Amino acid sequence: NATVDLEQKLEEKFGLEEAIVVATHDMSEEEALNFLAKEAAYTLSKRIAKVKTLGISWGKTIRKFANEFPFIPHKDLTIIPLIGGDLHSNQICYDLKKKMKCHSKYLYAPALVEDTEMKTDLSKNKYISEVLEEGKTVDMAIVGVSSPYNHSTMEEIGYINSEDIEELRYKDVVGDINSRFFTADGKEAKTEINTHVIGLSLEELKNIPTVVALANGLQKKEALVAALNAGLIDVIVITDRMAEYIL
């Protein structure tokens, strides 16, 4: 297979556990994203069958994954949101829980609290703290990778504004995973936003045994490549078009 060929090449290049590459015939970026979601759901349902605990992030790509996810029971699973706040981790986790008839936890908190004192009180409430600690110990996690630039989801939803974007640029940010903004070396930038997010940090993510990332769109190359080089990701699910571009 050219496909198996690309998967091998990606595993060798980035030191991945696995690369799942999806063959796009003649699809737009948008049509490829839906197909990637569908195939991710199919293939990843098999891995998820094997784990006890599953952490989920947020966003459009993960929302699509969840919509495509099959109705196979896994009643002993516990699903944990990795970030506070339709596209929200809590609602995604609940929808997956309904499909698997399993357990889930709710992160009773906003994703981004600019008020430092409030952020601090919430981070220390006991049900919030317990769900955060459960996130840190999941067997596997599914995340998206995004770029805060060129009119992204977070900006279009009013999560970050243009002044936050200029701060990120000034700080040489290249991408985000689980609303943590990282530089080219894959480390969280020293920036206010990163210290005000309620959810799993990049260093916490790096300690999860299997982190799966779903990404599409060539504008995310820089973000993805940096994440992959930093070892934040163990398994990628991407299109063959994206694979060619990042190889």
From TrEMBL:
This is Lmo0547 protein. Belongs to the SorC transcriptional regulatory family. One of its GO terms (molecular function) is cis-regulatory region sequence-specific DNA binding. GO terms for biological process: regulation of DNA-templated transcription initiation. The chain holds residues 61 to 311 of 315 of the full protein. Keywords: DNA-binding, Transcription, Transcription regulation. Transmembrane segments: none annotated. It comes from Listeria monocytogenes serovar 1/2a (strain ATCC BAA-679 / EGD-e).
